[PDB]
Each structure stands twice: as structure tokens, then as C-alpha cells.
Design a protein around this ligand. Structure first.
Ligand code: HAS
Ligand code: HEM
Ligand code: CUA
Ligand SMILES: [Cu+2]
Ligand SMILES: [Xe]
Ligand SMILES: [Xe]
Ligand SMILES: [Xe]
Ligand SMILES: [Xe]
Lengths: 33, 557, 166
């Protein structure tokens, strides 16, 4: 039909989850430096 | 001497079943220790009870070895061997060399038994990583060796099937499932070398008394050569099912054949030369090489990242054909009444947190935060204990019938959905509990319920670990009940044992051809993969082998 | 329909791939950053430093626990730690905060973990090998060492103590 709105919404959640994990632990790394 | 014309016509069906059964049996036995390990990480010590039930159990650690071995090693391998041989066989409609296929089952069985004896007798309480100097009984190492080598036969069988098919279809592109299976086994072959080397050069002569010392650094370097790719060896069979079977179960199609091929190709290329990510905290390994492996490891994440989109789009597609509404309508349109659909979809949900965990672990310096903590078990239960297992569990609903002719009643189908949801839910709760306690420096591989006051700051995540343990205990029980109810009924519709596998249709495009063609240069890509391994491991391994420092073995249980 | 969705997905797929790769390379840049800072000290020494595990507490820097700490620079103190079957030597390790503490850890039996709670110090200790990590404490107190690598039946009870000096 058209643009994969649901699939893009999924990989958005994935991307945000990746960012919270990575930046969340990137912060703790420097907090314990 | 064969009672059903279904097995005379499709003998591979029988061999497949034996792999499966043996696989799930090992899954059940190994998983029993799970609930107790969770309670342990909830600060509750239930082991006396376990000890009363299973007398042979001598400690927390023996139970953790059985858990890691029977679940992560045995179950997974057998499932793989079943899936990555049977599916490509049925797709090609070709019979695998049956002499060899039965040979591979006996190897796995004999190897399992031989290794089981010293494990069950507390002669091998070293965990599923069996790091030296910790010295187990010889029959553990021999048993494992044989069991793993079983795969080499499997590799041959598939390659054979592939050559034969290419002969009867000159100039035709490898069909999808077969392609996957082929790159899969080839990848495994290259991956397995690390372990083989460790076993052949050190482990086996060590445990037989030929040598008295083993260098610990080299042994664990070789181990992780195999160590990482093996998890992909666990993952890809599920992936195979997810790409080629799940879309059908969802009521849609695989939206891209080339995408799936690419994903698998990348895995062949990038699965093995990344083992140093398991060795960040090790000494004697150059920091530059660690960074290199760190980069290659972030690249091996790419295939998964593609999978995520390809599969999600296929599920969105399926949902739309079912009458999918808006941004989220497709989701509700899916068949949430069918376990074979539900199980893997849940697995994929938890895989998101799982993968994010991995990428973190993969970032060199950031590993120092979480290494050897409960975070790592948190990571992988989302990966293997959730996605792989659920997929395996859920595939029983089409697979078991296809092999046995035994139908599944509506009662079993609903029993399955409960098991599925509970397992998933339980896994999610534990994931939170272990990740939380892992950031709170609680170590893994620890009987911390024997030292109650050691970790007071993990008060609340300890609760989640208790909850999960209960939740999952119930689910496991229900699985056993439901699994046997199916394997112990005499209802037999031989027609459904002859029905084709519910493979999904694949949407193809114009540009496919030339890309697909390129990927089908298997011999080229194999050598390429081989070269990467020599490039990423060669330099280091050379220096280690020049300066071997073997130390004596220990028994500390 | 179906063949229209094929082109749309494969187009957003390429955009997703480009974005993913870009995000990964940012990570690679933010990891390359931490390697140029002072935090990168916790990275184990790359060069090989072989030792005998059977004579380590008989002859050598790990033989005498009293000579564990040793000022090796104006603000540098080299600590010779020994991780062994269910304990750490010296216990406790005593060092001044603000000073660069160069740990050199080894084991006489099996593999151990050296995890200093609160810090980035997380190194595997290997029998016959010296684990060499550099670290600067910036806060005073009693830092607890945890053994995070399974080392036998007393593994859960293997703890240590570092008392940085106010
Ligand atoms: C089978 C399970 C295994 C998988 C798979 C796995 C994946 C990764 N791992 Fe790992 N791992 C590490 C890094 C990674 C990375 C970068 C990935 C990547 O392959 C992950 C990529 C995943 C993604 C990029 C996510 C994609 C998301 C998808 C595909 C789901 C989308 C959902 C959909 C579409 C559904 C939507 C549905 C709707 C209805 C909306 C590292 C560090 O680099 C360590 C060492 C830690 C330490 O210090 O010990 C490590 C440790 C382990 C150990 C411990 C071994 C031991 O005992 O010492 C095990 C068993 C394990 C297994 C597995 N691991 N890993
Ligand atoms: C009944 C459900 C399960 C529960 C409640 C459970 C729980 C746990 C817990 C709490 C740990 C941490 C042990 C420790 O660090 O001391 C653990 C470790 C582990 N689990 Fe499970 N698990 C379950 C099922 C599975 C499955 C299905 C697999 C693989 C298919 C698996 C593979 C592993 C492995 C390989 C380890 C690490 C072993 C080691 O470090 O020696 N588990 N599990
Ligand atoms: Cu040393 Cu656990
Ligand atoms: Cu890995
Ligand atoms: Xe082995
Ligand atoms: Xe095994
Ligand atoms: Xe092996
Ligand atoms: Xe592993």
C-alpha cells in the first residue's frame, strides 16, 4: 500500500532503546573514571 | 523394519524427531535449576529443598554447570542440527545422506551420555566455559568433543545436499532456506576450529594425563574464537524460521529474499573474528586488537539490525492483509491465538533490550562496568533463553505434527499460549532483576544466598528475581505437562505428517537478480570469511604460541 | 500493492542502514575519545609479562606482603597484588588518593576477577601472567574488591579491601 509506518515505529523504539542503554552506560563509565 | 510409510518415504523425518526430543529433554532437565538460581539471585536459598528432591546435587555450582551445559550447549545444538538439516531438506525435497544423519545423532547421544556421567557425579563442576586451571574428569572433555563433532557430520550432509541440488539445477540460484543453511554450517565450521584446537592440543591430552599444564590465556583465547560465533550458531536456526516460516504463520509474506540472504552472508563473514569482546578484561592481549575486535563486533550487529526491519516490515505487511488499521492496527490484526506465531514474536520483543545490552557490552571500555556481573546473564537470557527457546517452543506446533502425525487439540493450543506468555513475562522480570543487580556490582556465577548480607543495595531487584523464579517455575511445569501430553497421545493423523512445511512466500523485485547472484558466490565468500579470521586472530595467536606458560590443574569443588 | 510495498520497504531499508552505520560510527568516535583520556588507564597492559604461579609467593615482588605498595614515581605507587584461592594479598591495600596507583596482579592457582566496587577497575587475573592496570582514586574510603570470575566453592566469599588514604 504505502510507507511502512508500523515497521518504522518498531525500529524507532529499537533506536531509542539503544540510545538509552548506550548513553546511560556511557555516563556511568565517566562517573566511575 | 519401519511401521509408518511416511518415514520410509521421508526417513529424515525420524532422525529430525530424535534430535528434537533429545533436545527438549535436555532443555527440561537443565531448566529445573533455573528457578532455584533465580531465587538465589533474589537472596533466597532454596537449595536444601532441591537437594532433598535431587540427592545427587552436591552444590550450587554443579547445578549451574548442568544448567549451562544442558540448556546453552546441548539443547541449542540439537535444535540447530534438527532445523538446519530438515528445513533445507524439505525445501529441496531431497533426502539427506541417512547413514550420516543417523551417525550424527548417535555421536550427539553417545557424547551427551559420556559427558553426563561425570557431570552427574560431581566430577566436572567447572561450568559450561570449563576454564583451566579448573580441571574436570576426562569423560567430560571426551564426551563434549564427540558431541560437538557431531556437527561436522551435519555440515557435510548439508553441503552434500547442496552440491547434489546444484547438479540437477545448473545455473539456478540456491533456494533461500538452503542458502541460509549452507552459509550457516560453513560459518560454524570455521567457528568450531577454536574449540577443536583447544580440545585437541590442550584439553584432551591434559585430562588423559599426557600433559600436566595448560596455558590459561591461550585456552580461553581459542575458546572465544568459537565462543562468540556459537551463540550465532544458536541464533540463526531461529532466524531461519523467523524469516521463512513466521511470515506464513502471521498470514503474510517475507518482504525480501535478498535482505535475508544478505543478513546471513554478513554472519558468515563477521561471526568468528570478534572473540576478544569476551576478553576485554584479559591481560596479555594488545588493547589495539581489542578495539579492532570491538569495531568488528559492532559490525556483526548490522545483520541483526537489518533483520529487525525486514521482519518487522513482514509482520506489518501480514497485519495489513489481515485488515491492519493505522500505525498500530496491524499489530492487533495478527494471529495472537496461534502459539507458533506468538512465541517468536514475544522473543523478538525482548530481543530489543537483549541486543542493546550486547552493543553496550561490545563497546570496549564500557564492558568494565558490567563484566562478570549479573548484567551479562541478564543480557543473554533475553537472547538465548527467550528468543531462541520461545521460537523453538512455538515451532513445536507445526513441527511436531509434521514429524509425528499427532494433531494438537484446542486445549493444548491454549496451554501453549499460557506457557508462552508466562515464560516471556518471567524472562522480562528476571531481565530487569539481573540488569539492575549487575549495575549494583553483584557478580554472576555466585551462590550469593549463602552470603545474605553481602549485597544490601540490591534489595528491590532481588524481589524481581524471586518473582521470575516463581513465574518461570510454573511455566516450565506447564511446558513439561503440555509437551508430554502431546508426545504421549495416540491420536495419529498420518495425512498431517505428509503435509508440506508452512514455508512463507517471498516477494521478489527487479534488482534482486544481480545482488542475489553475487551472494551466491559461496566459495568466494567462504575464503573471504576465512581470511578475516586469520587476520583478526593470526597476529595474536602467533605471539601467544611463542610464549606458552602452562600451569597445573586444580579441583576446587 | 505488494510490489509497491516492495520498493517502499527496500528504500526505507537503505535509509535505516545508512542511519544505523552513522550511529555506530558515533559510538566508535565516543569510544576513541575514552581511549585518549585518563579513564583509559583501566585497560590491561598489552605486553606479555610472564610469571611462575608456583613460586610467586616464595620469591619475587609478591613474596612479601609488607613490600606490596612501593612509590615508583613522585605521585605513582606500584601495588603488587596477589589474587588467590578465596582472598587478596595484601588485605587491605593501603594507598593515597590523588596518586596514580599501578596495580600488578597475578594468581598462584586459578583465574580470578579483580573488581573494585565503585571504579572502572575490572580485570581478569591469570595464573602465570601479570595483570597491569593504572587507576587514580579521587574519593576517599574503603573500596571493596569482588572476585567476579568463578574460582571454586569459596568464590562467592572472595572479597578484598583497598583503603585509599584521606
Ligand atoms: C543466543 C543469544 C546470543 C546473542 C544472539 C547475543 C548477541 C550479542 N551479544 Fe552476547 N555478548 C556480547 C555482545 C553481543 C552483541 C554485540 C550481540 C549482537 O548480536 C546483538 C544484536 C541485536 C540487535 C541489534 C537487536 C535487534 C532486534 C531485533 C531483531 C528485534 C526486533 C523485534 C521485532 C521486529 C518484533 C516486533 C513485533 C511487534 C508485534 C511490534 C558481549 C560484548 O561484546 C558479551 C561479553 C559480556 C561480558 O563481559 O562477559 C556478550 C556475552 C554473551 C554470553 C556470555 C558468555 C559467557 O558465559 O561468558 C552469552 C551466552 C551471549 C549470547 C548471545 N549474545 N552473549
Ligand atoms: C527456567 C527458566 C530459567 C531460569 C529461571 C534461568 C535463570 C538463570 C539464572 C538466575 C542464572 C544466573 C546464574 C548465576 O549467575 O549464578 C542463569 C544462568 C545461565 N542460564 Fe539460565 N535460566 C533459565 C533458562 C535457561 C535457558 C532456556 C537457557 C538456554 C537455552 C539458559 C542458559 C543459561 C546459561 C548458559 C547461564 C550461565 C551459566 C554459567 O554462568 O555458568 N537458562 N540462568
Ligand atoms: Cu576469585 Cu571468585
Ligand atoms: Cu559474543
Ligand atoms: Xe571440549
Ligand atoms: Xe555435552
Ligand atoms: Xe570440539
Ligand atoms: Xe559459550
Amino acid at each position: 500500500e504505502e510507507k511502512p509506518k508500523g515497521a518504522l515505529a518498531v525500529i524507532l523504539v529499537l533506536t531509542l532503546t539503544i540510545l538509552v542503554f548506550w548513553l546511560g552506560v556511557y555516563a556511568v563509565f565517566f562517573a566511575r573514571g | 523394519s519401519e511401521i509408518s510409510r511416511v518415514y520410509e518415504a521421508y526417513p529424515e523425518k525420524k532422525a529430525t524427531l530424535y534430535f528434537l526430543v533429545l533436545g527438549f529433554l535436555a532443555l527440561i532437565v537443565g531448566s529445573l535449576f533455573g528457578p532455584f538460581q533465580a531465587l538465589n539471585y533474589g537472596n533466597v536459598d532454596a537449595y536444601p529443598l532441591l537437594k532433598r528432591l535431587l540427592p545427587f546435587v552436591q552444590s550450587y555450582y554443579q547445578g549451574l554447570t548442568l544448567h549451562g551445559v544442558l540448556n546453552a550447549i546441548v539443547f541449542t545444538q540439537l535444535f540447530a542440527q534438527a532445523i538446519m538439516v530438515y528445513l533445507p531438506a524439505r525445501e529441496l525435497n531431497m533426502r539427506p545422506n541417512m547413514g550420516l544423519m543417523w551417525l550424527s545423532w548417535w555421536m550427539a547421544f553417545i557424547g551427551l551420555v559420556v559427558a553426563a556421567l561425570p557431570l552427574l557425579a560431581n566430577e566436572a563442576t567447572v561450568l559450561y566455559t570449563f576454564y583451566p586451571p579448573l580441571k574436570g574428569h576426562w569423560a567430560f572433555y571426551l564426551g563434549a568433543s564427540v558431541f560437538v563433532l557431531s556437527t561436522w557430520v551435519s555440515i557435510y550432509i548439508v553441503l552434500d545436499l547442496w552440491r547434489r541440488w546444484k547438479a540437477a539445477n545448473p545455473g539456478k540460484v540456491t533456494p533461500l532456506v538452503t542458502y541460509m543453511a549452507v552459509v550457516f554450517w560453513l560459518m560454524w565450521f570455521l567457528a568450531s576450529l577454536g574449540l577443536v584446537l583447544e580440545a585437541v592440543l590442550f584439553l584432551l591430552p591434559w585430562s588423559f594425563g599426557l600433559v600436566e599444564g595448560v596455558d590459561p590465556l591461550v585456552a580461553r583465547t581459542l575458546f572465544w574464537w568459537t565462543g562468540h560465533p556459537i551463540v550465532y550458531f544458536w541464533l540463526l536456526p531461529a532466524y531461519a524460521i523467523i524469516y521463512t516460516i513466521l511470515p506464513k504463520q502471521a498470514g503474510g509474506k517475507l518482504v525480501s529474499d535478498p535482505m535475508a540472504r544478505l543478513a546471513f552472508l554478513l554472519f558468515l563473514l563477521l561471526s568468528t573474528p570478534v572473540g576478544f569482546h569476551h576478553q576485554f578484561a584479559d591481560p596479555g592481549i594488545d588493547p589495539t586488537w581489542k578495539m579492532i575486535h570491538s569495531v568488528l563486533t559492532l559490525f556483526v550487529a548490522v545483520p541483526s539490525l537489518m533483520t529487525a526491519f525486514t521482519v518487522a516490515a513482514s509482520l506489518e505487511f501480514a497485519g495489513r492483509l489481515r485488515g491492519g488499521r493505522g500505525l498500530f492496527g496491524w499489530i492487533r490484526a495478527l494471529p495472537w491465538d496461534n502459539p507458533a506465531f506468538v512465541a517468536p514474536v514475544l522473543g523478538l520483543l525482548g530481543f530489543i533490550p537483549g541486543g542493546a545490552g550486547g552493543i553496550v557490552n561490545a563497546s570496549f571500555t564500557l564492558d568494565y562496568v558490567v563484566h562478570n556481573t549479573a548484567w551479562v546473564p541478564g543480557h543473554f537470557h533475553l537472547q538465548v533463553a527467550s528468543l531462541v527457546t520461545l521460537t523453538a517452543m512455538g515451532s513445536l506446533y507445526w513441527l511436531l505434527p509434521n514429524l509425528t502425525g499427532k494433531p494438537i487439540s484446542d486445549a493444548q493450543r491454549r496451554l501453549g499460549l499460557a506457557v508462552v506468555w508466562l515464560w516471556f513475562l518471567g524472562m522480562m522480570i528476571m531481565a530487569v532483576g539481573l540488569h539492575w543487580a549487575g549495575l549494583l556490582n553483584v557478580p554472576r556465577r555466585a551462590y550469593i544466598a549463602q552470603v545474605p548480607d553481602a549485597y544490601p543495595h540490591a534489595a528491590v531487584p532481588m524481589v524481581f528475581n524471586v518473582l521470575a523464579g516463581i513465574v518461570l517455575l510454573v511455566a516450565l511445569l506447564l511446558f513439561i505437562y503440555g509437551l508430554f501430553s502431546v508426545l504421549l497421545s495416540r491420536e495419529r493423523k498420518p495425512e498431517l505428517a505428509e503435509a508440506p512445511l508452512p514455508f512463507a512466500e517471498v516477494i521478489s523485485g527487479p534488482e534482486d537478480r544481480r545482488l542475489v547472484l553475487a551472494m551466491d558466490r559461496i566459495g568466494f565468500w567462504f575464503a573471504v570469511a576465512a581470511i578475516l579470521v586469520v587476520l583478526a586472530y593470526g597476529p595474536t595467536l602467533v605471539q601467544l604460541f611463542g610464549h606458552l606458560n602452562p600451569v597445573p590443574g586444580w579441583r576446587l569443588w | 500493492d505488494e510490489h509497491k510495498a516492495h520498493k517502499a520497504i527496500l528504500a526505507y531499508e537503505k535509509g535505516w542502514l545508512a542511519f544505523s552505520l552513522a550511529m555506530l560510527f558515533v559510538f566508535i568516535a565516543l569510544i576513541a575519545y575514552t581511549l585518549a583520556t585518563h579513564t583509559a588507564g583501566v585497560i590491561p597492559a598489552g605486553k606479555l609479562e610472564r610469571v611462575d604461579p608456583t613460586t610467586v609467593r616464595q620469591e619475587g615482588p609478591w613474596a612479601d606482603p609488607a613490600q606490596a605498595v612501593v612509590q615508583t614515581g613522585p605521585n605513582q605507587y606500584t601495588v603488587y597484588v596477589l589474587a588467590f584461592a578465596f582472598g587478596y594479598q595484601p588485605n587491605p591495600i593501603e594507598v593515597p588518593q590523588g596518586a596514580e596507583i599501578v596495580f600488578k596482579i597475578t594468581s598462584p592457582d586459578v583465574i580470578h576477577g579483580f573488581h573494585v566496587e565503585g571504579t572502572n577497575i575490572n580485570v581478569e587475573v591469570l595464573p602465570g601472567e601479570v595483570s597491569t592496570v593504572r587507576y587514580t582514586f579521587k574519593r576517599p574510603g574503603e573500596y571493596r574488591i569482588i572476585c567476579n570470575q568463578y574460582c571454586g566453592l569459596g568464590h562467592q566469599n572472595m572479597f578484598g579491601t583497598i583503603v585509599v588514604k584521606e
